[PDB]
Amino acid sequence: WAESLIGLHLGKVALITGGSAGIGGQIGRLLALSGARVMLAARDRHKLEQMQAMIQSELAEVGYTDVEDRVHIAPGCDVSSEAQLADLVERTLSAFGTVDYLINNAGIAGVEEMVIDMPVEGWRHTLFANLISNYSLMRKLAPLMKKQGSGYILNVSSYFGGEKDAAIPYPNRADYAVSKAGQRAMAEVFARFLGPEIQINAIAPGPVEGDRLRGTGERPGLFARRARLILENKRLNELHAALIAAARTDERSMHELVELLLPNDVAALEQNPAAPTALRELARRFRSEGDPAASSSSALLNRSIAAKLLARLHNGGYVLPADIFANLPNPPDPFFTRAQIDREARKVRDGIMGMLYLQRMPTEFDVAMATVYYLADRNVSGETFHPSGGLRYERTPTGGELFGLPSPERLAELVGSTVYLIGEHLTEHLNLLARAYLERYGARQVVMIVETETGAETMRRLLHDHVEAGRLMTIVAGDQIEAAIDQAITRYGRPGPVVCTPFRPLPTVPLVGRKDSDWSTVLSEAEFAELCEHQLTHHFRVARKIALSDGASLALVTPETTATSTTEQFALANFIKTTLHAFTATIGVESERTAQRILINQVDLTRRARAEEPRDPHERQQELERFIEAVLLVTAPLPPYAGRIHRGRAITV
């Protein structure tokens, strides 16, 4: 079977991250069988040694000589660590010389929580492991590839990273979806700069049969974990919604309502006459729909669900002691039975198998085979190859350019509203937007949340009249946007419209170096992380906080490009736009599954080509008015199908 591989990649040097098991292990195996010298990078030394011995033994069997020179390993390499990425390149370069193929395969599952329960550091770690590492390794390897005249960068993305002009929601996986979308976006925008010497593509497999999805006897896989999370998330969401519902119609504090959960007894809560109807109906549901052998049928929660519930409540402005669940009676194992988890795990697998046009998943060998043949194609760059797939899953087309003004019914709902505007760099857009809300649509007040004092002063001066009339309030957020939103809520009340623009502009730096250059001026590994911080994480932090604020409409705004903007700014802007679509679509679906009525849409200020951009002051004026219309179209509340249309969507100004 390996006879079709001999000579296919002979003379090539390949670097495979996550090369000790899964898809990566197979790509490394098949590349070695194809004649390539391979370096396998992963954390565990033992797994890396096992795979190396397995590949070397196989190479010897087909006829190869000095097989130890063909398969090298790089243990203790965590792709989320920059230092480890620098040590990997040096170890690979010393071992084999220049790298021809960079296989950015490593990809952690990530946080596996809804955005509202996703720690900011967890989101950051996934971006570093899955996305920032891809740029870091390309940045260290592309100068030597351009010098020798050839090279290939392959990013192992996913079907759940979406496609060129459509976003795919991936609930409970926003960090993951974004990182996969960014890997694809990198191939799409860097191809024009990396060519003619270097090819850059993404592979986006659909679900694959293997240990990641199926799991081992010792450790549960993606399906079993997703099954356990479905059950745990269901308990968290139901408890949270019932507490928010009861709080509306009950005069007791959230603290007093949470105190009713403390005996942690489903039966005692159901028959408690002093408890609100929403909590009693919830207890009845927990015992009625539950498994009698599961302690989740007799106990309300466990220490883990209690901590997530507490953080949701704290993040949503409710005042509760941090020790409220300290003496919570711990339910006896199992909280959810193996029967409940298996039924849920079977539903996940059956649902996926149903979505697949071919009603079958490829093996890791199959995906690696399609990839190794794909790597032989020298005439394709900036593409996303789908080695498996074709799924019935819903996609959200992005890039609607043709739109108009929202209805007068929706506009009259803006009268007397509280507007939050977040930004710094886009002073013109922020000034015009604050004025449109206050002067045209009679909003009660605008809270201008900036990053710095210099930004606050610039906005206060531009809006001097509204500042004088107590209509425009300014808050300096710094790198504490969550505390800044809390300040705005406490002092000026909860918002209706929320317009989140980036604080920072896109950098004006080269994306590739000249053939004989040192690449010293080229966008660094640290600057690429900052780009993701300022242009992705910024929006995620605001969305995480605003998704717990009832009655809010959030517009996530992407960077601005002009006829003046550098070609590098166009690339980076298009990279962001695409990557943030994955986030916007994912959180849009997650928001449906919450108690809070919250709309989240994306407004794109960036365009693919310079030819589309305005060229005169009249064409600029049309653009700025189009921006206001786009924001109003997504921020004006829907007065009591239309909800599906007005969420996780993105329009191009």
Q: Binding site residues for NADP(+), as ranges? A: 18, 20-21, 23, 43-44, 47, 78-79, 105, 176, 180, 208, 212, 214-215
- Residue 36: partners with Cβ closer than 8 Å, 6 or more residues away: 9, 10, 11, 12, 13, 14, 70, 100, 101
Q: Identity (one letter) of the amino acid at 270? A: E
Is there binding between residue 629 and ligand NAP (CB under 6 A)? no
The verdict on 409 binding a second copy (CB under 8 A) reads no
Count Cα atoms within 13 angstroms, Cβ side, for 633.
21
| Cβ neighbours for 286, distance < 8 A, ≥ 6 positions apart | 238, 266, 296, 297, 300
Please identify, among the stretches 160-168, 218-226, 430-438, 544-552, the one whose residues bind a second copy according to the rule CB under 8 A: 160-168
Query: Does residue 18 interact with ligand NAP by CB under 6 A?
Result: yes
Q: Radius of gyration (Cα) for the chain, nearest Å?
A: 26
Among 357, 461, 465, 469, binds a second copy (CB under 8 A): 357
Q: DSSP of 430-448, one letter per residue?
A: HHHHHHIIIIIS--SEEEE
Per the CB < 8 A criterion, the answer to whether 562 and 611 are in contact is no
Which token pair is 42?
A: 């992963």
* DSSP notation for 551-602: T-EEEEEPPP--SSS-HHHHHHHHHHHHHHHHHHHHHHHHHHTSSS--EEEE
Q: In whole angstroms, how close is the CB of 225 to ligand NAP at the nearest point?
A: 12
Query: Residues marked as binding for Mg(2+)?
Result: 247, 250, 561, 591, 596, 613, 623
The verdict on 460 binding a second copy (CB under 8 A) reads no
Nearer to ligand NAP, 387 or 495 (CB): 387
Residue 385 interacting entry, from a second copy, ligand NAP, none, C-beta within 5 to 8 Å by type: a second copy
Q: How far apart are CA 408 and CA 292, in angstroms?
A: 54
Residues 154-193 touching ligand NAP, rule: CB under 6 A, are 156, 158
| From 20, 431, 549, 606, residue interacting with ligand NAP (rule: CB under 6 A) | 20
Residue 644 lies near a second copy (rule: CB under 8 A): yes
- Per-residue binding string, a second copy, 378-407, x by CB under 8 A, is xxxxxx-xxxxxx-x-xx-xxxxxxxxxxx
Distance of CA 429 to the CA centre of its chain: 26
* Shortest separation between residue 158's beta carbon and a second copy, angstroms: 14
Q: Rule CB under 8 A: is residue 637 a binding residue for a second copy?
A: no
> Out of ligand NAP, a second copy, none, which partner does residue 24 contact, by CB within 5 to 8 A per kind?
ligand NAP
Contact 616, 418 (CB under 8 A): no
Is 499 a binding residue for a second copy by CB under 8 A? The answer is no
Q: Which residues contact 517 (CB under 8 A, 6 or more apart)?
A: 143
The piece of 13-21, 167-175, 326-334, 576-584 that touches ligand NAP (CB under 6 A) is 13-21
211 binds ligand NAP, rule: CB under 6 A: yes
Q: Does 125 bind ligand NAP (CB under 6 A)?
A: no
Q: Which stretch binds ligand NAP (CB under 6 A): 18-26, 442-450, 508-516, 631-639?
A: 18-26
Name the minimum Å distance from CB 173 to a second copy.
20
Q: Does 28 bind ligand NAP (CB under 6 A)?
A: no
Q: Nearest distance from residue 196's CB to a second copy, in Å?
A: 4
CB of 299 to a second copy, least distance (A): 36
The number of C-alpha atoms within 13 Å of 537 and in the hemisphere containing its C-beta is: 23
The option from ligand NAP, a second copy, none interacting with 373 (CB < 5 to 8 A, set by class) reads a second copy
Instruction: Give me the phi and psi of 286, to 5 degrees please.
Output: -60, -40
Q: Is 22 an interacting residue with respect to a second copy (CB under 8 A)?
A: no
The yes or no reply on residue 7 touching a second copy (CB under 8 A) is yes
Residue 578 burial class via C-beta count within 10 angstroms: exposed 0-12, middle 13-18, buried 19 and up: buried
Residue 95 sits at φ, ψ, to 5 deg, of -70, -50
User: Letter for the amino acid at 351?
Assistant: G
Residue 645: both structure tokens together: 């249309």
Query: Under a CB-based contact definition with an 8 Å cutoff, are residues 58 and 30 in contact?
Result: no
Residue list for the binding site:
18, 20-21, 23, 43-44, 47, 78-79, 105, 176, 180, 208, 212, 214-215, 247, 250, 561, 591, 596, 613, 623
Residue the block writes with tokens 């694959």: 208
Instruction: Decide if 524 contacts 139 (C-beta within 8 A).
Output: yes
Q: How far is the CB of 141 from ligand NAP (least distance, A)?
A: 17
In this structure, the number of other CB atoms found within 10 A of the CB of residue 268 comes to 14
CB 74, CB 88: distance < 8 Å = yes
CB of 406 to a second copy, least distance (A): 5
Asked if 142 interacts with a second copy (CB under 8 A), we say no
Task: Supply the minimum distance, in Å, between the C-beta of residue 210 and ligand NAP.
Answer: 5
Minimal distance, residue 323 CB to a second copy, in Å: 45
For the CB of residue 586, give the shortest distance to ligand NAP in the complex, in Å. 15
Q: Check binding of 199 to a second copy (CB under 8 A).
A: yes
Single out the residue of 298, 279, 389, 309 nearest to residue 336, CA to CA: 298
CA angle, residues 446, 450, 456, in degrees to nearest 5: 85
Residue 360 in contact with ligand NAP, rule: CB under 6 A? no
Task: Return the range that interacts with ligand NAP (CB under 6 A); candidates 38-46, 273-281, 509-517, 616-624.
Answer: 38-46
CB of 607 to a second copy, least distance (A): 10
Q: Could you say whether residue 110 binds ligand NAP (CB under 6 A)? A: no
Contact flag: residue 42 with ligand NAP (CB under 6 A): yes
80 in contact with ligand NAP (CB under 6 A): yes
Spatial separation of the C-alpha atoms in residues 199 and 558, rounded to whole Å: 27
Q: What residues make contact with ligand NAP under the rule CB under 6 A?
A: 17-24, 42-44, 47, 77-80, 105-108, 129, 156, 158, 205, 207-208, 210-213
